[PDB]
Amino acid sequence: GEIQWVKPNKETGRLSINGPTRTKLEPSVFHDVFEGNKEPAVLHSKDPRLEVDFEQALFSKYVGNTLYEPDEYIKEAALHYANQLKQLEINTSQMSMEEACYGTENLEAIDLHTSAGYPYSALGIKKRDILDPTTRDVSKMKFYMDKYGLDLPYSTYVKDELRSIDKIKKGKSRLIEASSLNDSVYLRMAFGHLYETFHANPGTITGSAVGCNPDTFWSKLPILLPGSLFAFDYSGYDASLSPVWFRALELVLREIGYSEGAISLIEGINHTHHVYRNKTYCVLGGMPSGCSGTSIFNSMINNIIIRALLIKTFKGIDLDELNMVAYGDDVLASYPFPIDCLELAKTGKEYGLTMTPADKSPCFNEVNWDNATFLKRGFLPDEQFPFLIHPTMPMREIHESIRWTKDARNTQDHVRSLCLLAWHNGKQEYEKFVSTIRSVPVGRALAIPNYENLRRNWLELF
Ligand code: NI
Numbered sequence: 001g002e003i004q005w006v007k008p009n010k011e012t013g014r015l016s017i018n019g020p021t022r023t024k025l026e027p028s029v030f031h032d033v034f035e036g037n038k039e040p041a042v043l044h045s046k047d048p049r050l051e052v053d054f055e056q057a058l059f060s061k062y063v064g065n066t067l068y069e070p071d072e073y074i075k076e077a078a079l080h081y082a083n084q085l086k087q088l089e090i091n092t093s094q095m096s097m098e099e100a101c102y103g104t105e106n107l108e109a110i111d112l113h114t115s116a117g118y119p120y121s122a123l124g125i126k127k128r129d130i131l132d133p134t135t136r137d138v139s140k141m142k143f144y145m146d147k148y149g150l151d152l153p154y155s156t157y158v159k160d161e162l163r164s165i166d167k168i169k170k171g172k173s174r175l176i177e178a179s180s181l182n183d184s185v186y187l188r189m190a191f192g193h194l195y196e197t198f199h200a201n202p203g204t205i206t207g208s209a210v211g212c213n214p215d216t217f218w219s220k221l222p223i224l225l226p227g228s229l230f231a232f233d234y235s236g237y238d239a240s241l242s243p244v245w246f247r248a249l250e251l252v253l254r255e256i257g258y259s260e261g262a263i264s265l266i267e268g269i270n271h272t273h274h275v276y277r278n279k280t281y282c283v284l285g286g287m288p289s290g291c292s293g294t295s296i297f298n299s300m301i302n303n304i305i306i307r308a309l310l311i312k313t314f315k316g317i318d319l320d321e322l323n324m325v326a327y328g329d330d331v332l333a334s335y336p337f338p339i340d341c342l343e344l345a346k347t348g349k350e351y352g353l354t355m356t357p358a359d360k361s362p363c364f365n366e367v368n369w370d371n372a373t374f375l376k377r378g379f380l381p382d383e384q385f386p387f388l389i390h391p392t393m394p395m396r397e398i399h400e401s402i403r404w405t406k407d408a409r410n411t412q413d414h415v416r417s418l419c420l421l422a423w424h425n426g427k428q429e430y431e432k433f434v435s436t437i438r439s440v441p442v443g444r445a446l447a448i449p450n451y452e453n454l455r456r457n458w459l460e461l462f
Contacts, residue, residue, distance in 0.1 A: 001286020015122035057171025061239035077307035095192030237329030246270035
């Protein structure tokens with residue numbers, strides 16, 4: 001991805017948003033009971049902790065575009081993923097606005113608590129004003145869709161979340177790039193059925209884990225990805241995507257039967273205008289973070305990329321032997337033989353992709369079921385029933401996170417949530433976690449859930 005220009009909002013005529021004021025994250029009543037080294041991300045320019053220039057840290061994610069136009073390696077990839085999709089019989093037809101907004105059994109309703117984007121947030125119009133689940137009215141949406149039309153700027157602001165000290169010093173906060181309600185509705189209308197099938201089918205046909213529930217999906221993963229695993233990390237995947245990938249996405253949507261109208265939506269994703277604060281700017285390449293189908297399209301795109309890398313890098317590689325699931329940038333794969341990911345990573349840099357070994361690793365080593373990471377989590381066979389895999393959220397992460405809160409009344413649920421994650425790590429870990437919690441009179445007053453109750457519940461899902 002690459003910014004093409006920047007200009008003042010007076011010139012472009014775009015409305016401006018309020019800068020978020022303070023972080024909403026406070027010290028929790030466990031702030032110093034547990035250890036970690038994370039604080040609220042830098043949320044503005046004058047943050048006393050900044051060792052560098054903010055705005056140029058913000059936008060350095062956009063490392064250029066290396067290629068605008070699919071070569072043969074990419075076209076063949078796209079087509080193989082497209083042919084693979086064929087068997088899911090994706091409904092290529094437009095979804096009703098009602099469903100688009102209000103959801104069906106496999107597409108969640110538009111989230112009423114998120115911002116409505118441009119120009120809604122600048123005018124103080126909230127989704128709640130336009131959308132009511134109790135009536136499923138779409139007449140108001142039609143009205144605003146007429147009023148402001150389509151293909152609007154992405155309203156961009158800083159994500160209020162926890163970051164390492166390293167990222168706070170180095171100004172590496174993350175951006176939220178929210179598409180306008182108008183464009184979310186329209187994208188969902190054009191691709192809602194695709195979203196539905198993808199939610200209903202996490203696995204190796206879609207090649208997508210979006211919407212999976214790791215509680216159960218983890219047990220399928222060994223079966224779905226047999227033979228020899230592989231996995232790595234990308235640095236700033238989203239922003240490093242050059243247009244070529246949007247082009248390749250188009251080939252895939254064409255080949256599975258989409259109309260040209262629906263396909264033209266993609267250019268409005270590959271080429272976006274954003275409004276960060278007082279300026280508006282043009283990005284060409286890069287998946288916006290907050291675009292309706294971000295997750296899926298990123299996941300689809302990654303399906304294209306892994307295949308392209310494979311067949312550009314190795315000869316006689318048979319793509320039907322591949323298995324992968326992708327959740328945005330995050331991929332878990334297998335193949336019947338080992339795969340030299342160092343060479344993949346090199347091929348990757350040619351395309352503008354930065355690939356590093358799995359889990360901050362020193363080296364492109366072995367990934368097996370024991371060290372493998374997916375959606376932050378590791379894989380641990382249940383001791384009694386080894387066919388059941390537990391998703392292991394590192395405790396390090398659970399510790400970091402319990403030390404802060406955005407709502408001071410939520411301690412109870414905040415701890416319970418963390419417990420629902422921590423127990424997958426084993427009885428002895430869990431006890432260690434709960435005992436630290438219970439190490440402080442406030443801990444002791446909480447209803448903390450029982451290890452063997454959590455486990456009996458977990459079994460009852462299989
Ligand atoms: Ni532009």
